Structure formats: C-alpha cells, structure tokens
C-alpha cells in the first residue's frame, strides 16, 4: 500500500466522469422525497464530527455507507487504537463546491480519529482499497471520498 500524494486523485479522471463517481443528480434537501434515500450510519467505530449538532454528517447513500463501513475496518487494522473520522457527510450548510456530491449524500470528508495529518495519504489509499469510486487528497486537513449513485 502506497499513500496518495497531496492533491492526487484516483482514478486519474474528473470526479463526475463515468469511470469515477459519475454525474451530479442534483441537491437533496431535508424537505425532498429523495431525503428518504439517505440513511444514517451508526457504526460505533466511526467518529462523526457533527459540529452542526444535527447528525447530518451521518446521513449518506447506501453505497457510501457500504464503502465507509469497509474503510472503518481497514483503519483500525492499519493503526492500533485509531478510528476513521467523518468531518462532513451529507451537507445542508453550502460548505462545499457549487454542485458537491456532499449535497446528495454521496461524499464524505475524512481524517483519522487522532487528526494526525501524516496518516492522511495512507488513509486515502485505504479509501481506494475500501472501494470508494473517487478519492482526492483535497487539503492538508482531509481526504474527500465519493461514490456512484444507486441509479
């Protein structure tokens, strides 16, 4: 396992292209019918920042949950006593790019539980192995991970 480099993205194509996570199907709000397609993740081994105090960080698509749960296991295996941490999941605060996959519950920003920035490259590589459709070493402070839509 080789850590991703700073600003590296895998696969080597734009996020919203067919070979990666594919196209934006539009914003999901708390009002929407599509809100019901979002399910909360209560994995006791994932730390959710939830600075919003709304539980929004836990809300994501079924595929997002599945890859996230896989990555939870591989993080605990990589570093004893450390857990996967989500800073953002589904977003209703407009805290992302203009048509962010966060707005439809298809992306997570992640760190390790210890917020050790030196682990983040390897954390990104674990996200690729866990089967995220697109992984991007987006900032010094986080890894952005996204998935294809259910449809």
């Amino acid at each position, epitope marked *: 396992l080789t850590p991703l480099a700073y600003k590296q993205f895998i696969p080597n194509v734009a996020e919203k292209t067919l070979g990666a996570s594919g196209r934006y199907e539009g914003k999901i709000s708390r009002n929407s019918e599509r809100f019901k397609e979002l399910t909360p993740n209560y994995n006791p081994d994932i730390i959710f920042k939830d*600075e919003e105090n709304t539980g929004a960080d836990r809300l994501m698509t079924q595929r997002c949950k599945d890859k996230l749960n896989a990555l939870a296991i591989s993080v605990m295996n990589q570093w004893p006593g450390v857990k996967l941490r989500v800073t953002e999941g589904w977003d209703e*605060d407009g805290h992302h*790019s203009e048509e962010s996959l966060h707005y439809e519950g298809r992306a997570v*920003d992640i760190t390790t539980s210890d*917020r050790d920035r030196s682990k983040y490259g390897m954390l990104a590589r674990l996200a690729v192995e866990a089967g995220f459709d697109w992984v991007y070493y987006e*900032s010094k*402070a986080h890894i952005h991970c996204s998935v294809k839509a259910e449809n």
Partner: antibody
Framework: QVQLQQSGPELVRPGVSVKISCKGS????????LHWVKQSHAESLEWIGV????????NYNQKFKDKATMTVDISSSTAYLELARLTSEDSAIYYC????????????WGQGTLVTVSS | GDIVMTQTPKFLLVSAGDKVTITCKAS??????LTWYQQKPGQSPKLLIY???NRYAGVPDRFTGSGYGTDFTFTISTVQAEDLAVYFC?????????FGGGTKVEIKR
C-alpha cells in the same frame, strides 16, 4: 453565533512582554484549531502560528519562534498569545482566527487587539 | 524559502456596475491552496473564496476566483457600493501560510 472575543488594547515598553487572549463561543472549542495573525502597515498580514486545543500541539512561523508563545485554557474556551522582548516592529493589530478543518485558512476572525510598543 | 505572494494592482478606483480584476502571483506553485479575503474599513477580514474558486456559503455570485499553480485571478463582475474594502490573497500550500499585500478597492461616484 461563532464568535472570537479578543482582549483590549495594550501599551507596553520595549523589552517587556505582553499576553493577549481570544475567547471562542458558539462552537465546541476543541473542534477547531486557532491561528494568530499580525497586521502592521509595514508587512500587511503575517501568520504567527497555530494551536490545536484538542492535542495542545503548536506550530510556529520560524520568523516568530523567539517572539511568540501560544497556550489554551479549554475550560474557559480561551487561547493566549504571549509576545516577549518587544520592539516598535512589534506594534500591530493581532488577530486570532479559526479554521474549519478545510486547510490553514480562516472563516471566523477576532476583532483584533492593538498592541502599541512604546516608551 | 517561504512563498511570496505578489498582489496587483495596489489600488483600483471603480464606479458601481464595473468589473474589478485582482491578480495574485506566487513565487512558486501553490496548487489551488489560495484563499481570497475582504477587509471592510474598521473590520476583521472576511473569507470570500477558498481552493482558488469555491465561494464560501452566503458569498454573492459577483465574486469569483480562478487559477492553479502561481497565477490567480479574483473578479467582482459588477462591483457594488458596499464592496469597498482591501482584498487579500493567502496561500497555504507551503508552511508558513503567506498573504498578498492587498488591493484597496475605492468607489468612484
């Protein structure tokens, strides 16, 4: 609702030290890092350093390493900047500023503390 | 070598409705780790743009940013009276983070 409240203006002689404060409210204090930024006519904005209250870790700009000490009191949601062996080059507005775990840039800024170093 | 941000112009006089174009050039590439702030008179800086082109929540459409590497562009498409401020770029690709010297935007009426 997020606010950073800084301490008042300071007059201090050259060669004396001064300690200024920044109190955070409307968020969980250990959720975000706190940065210190100097604003002077001569040098515009300069990053002094960062303190992570969750771990107590500090990173200093090497230009301020001998000048500046950063500390936090979690119980009072307050960060402190201590500046030592001051000269008139140290006269400036000092800001505290929060990041939001997106990178080392700042969504919330204190109102600023004016420090005048003078005899 | 710390990264040096050179901002131009230093001053702009502009009428309401007109375009503002501000340039930030880094001494070496900073990827897209480039942030634009607005500092209105007597206030603290306010975040408008981060990752070179992303508007912060609630920032109006007239504010945009572009660039990757050394050369960054900040634009107010149609400046308004309340946009008078000093605008500053900041890189955080390299340690320490470093700021441009600012561009004062003054209104012609």
């Amino acid at each position: 609702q997020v606010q950073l409240q800084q301490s008042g203006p300071e007059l201090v002689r050259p060669g004396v030290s001064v300690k200024i404060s920044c109190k955070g409210s409307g968020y969980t204090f250990i959720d975000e890092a706190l940065h210190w930024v100097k604003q002077s006519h001569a040098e515009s904005l300069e990053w002094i350093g960062v303190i992570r209250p969750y771990s107590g870790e500090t990173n200093y700009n090497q230009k301020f390493k001998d000048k500046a000490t950063m500390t936090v009191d979690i119980s009072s949601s307050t960060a402190y900047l201590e500046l030592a062996r001051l000269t008139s080059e140290d006269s400036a507005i000092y800001y505290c500023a929060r990041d939001w775990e997106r990178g080392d840039f700042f969504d919330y800024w204190g109102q600023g503390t004016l420090v005048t170093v003078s005899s | 070598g710390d990264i040096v941000m050179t901002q131009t112009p230093k001053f702009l006089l502009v009428s309401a409705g007109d375009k503002v174009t501000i340039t930030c050039k880094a001494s070496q590439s900073v990827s897209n780790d480039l942030t634009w702030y607005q500092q209105k008179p007597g206030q603290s800086p306010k975040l408008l743009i981060y990752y070179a082109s992303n508007r912060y929540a609630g920032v109006p459409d007239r504010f945009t940013g572009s660039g990757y590497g050394t050369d960054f562009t900040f634009t107010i498409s149609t400046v308004q009276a309340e946009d008078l401020a000093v605008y500053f770029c900041q890189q955080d690709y390299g340690s320490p983070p470093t700021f441009g010297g600012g561009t004062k935007v003054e209104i012609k009426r």
